[PDB]
Design a binder for this molecule. Sequence first.
Ligand SMILES: O=C(Nc1cccc(Cl)c1)Nc1ncc(CCNc2ncnc3ccsc23)s1
Length: 256
Amino acid sequence: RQWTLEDFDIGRPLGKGKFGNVYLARERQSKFILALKVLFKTQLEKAGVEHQLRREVEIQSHLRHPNILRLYGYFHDATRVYLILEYAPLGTVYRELQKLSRFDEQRTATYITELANALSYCHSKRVIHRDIKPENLLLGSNGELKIADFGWSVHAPSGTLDYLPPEMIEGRMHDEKVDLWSLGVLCYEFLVGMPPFEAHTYQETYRRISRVEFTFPDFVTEGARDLISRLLKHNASQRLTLAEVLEHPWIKANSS
Ligand SMILES: O=C(Nc1cccc(Cl)c1)Nc1ncc(CCNc2ncnc3ccsc23)s1
């Protein structure tokens, strides 16, 4: 179907960045509710990202998983590009973490399981996400995690610095293990309420990631310390596999 903007009723903003806003939308004919992200062509070409966008759409025509948000298609006009997305009724994990401050051990491990299942599938098709962070994790109507925004994704091998591994911040070669590090940064932020290498400047953060300089607060349990520490390894190969995450005593104990 050759979609046009007139096929939709547009509703409230769902979110917004400086690439474009996301709006609630309803397809006029079916009454189907979805999300429309409105990207400006000027912004995309002035940043030379039009190719990464074209690849995202292409990657998202193949990926089908309950824990990956759907990109149903796209259409353009004179000035803007419109992405046709699955609506995530419970919003972002980013907003949920701001509200709750931090996540208990049970909801953390459940998210990490859902994220690990999504990434396991992605890594099978040789797709690496590279941009795992709370703002790209959204919540389905049953509170289930969905990974979103495949714009920075690539086939392996190939904002803030908080979630990026050493091999990536140092402009070097990298593979799947990128997502494995980001999963460990997430586990930590879920539990603590802030990411492990947080600093007030880009340059302090960069120093902390490459030297892997992080400490745990008192309340983090030994099983969680163990998971996170086996994930946040400078040497990519030493890290841990998704299968080792999913079969981890802490995940098994606490995941629902
Ligand atoms: O942005 C891109 N690609 C992109 C953008 C700019 C440049 C390039 Cl190169 C690529 N892709 C995305 N895929 C999913 C996205 C999530 C949109 N947000 C939401 N979607 C559904 N429900 C809710 C509810 C709360 S927010 C929200 S964004």
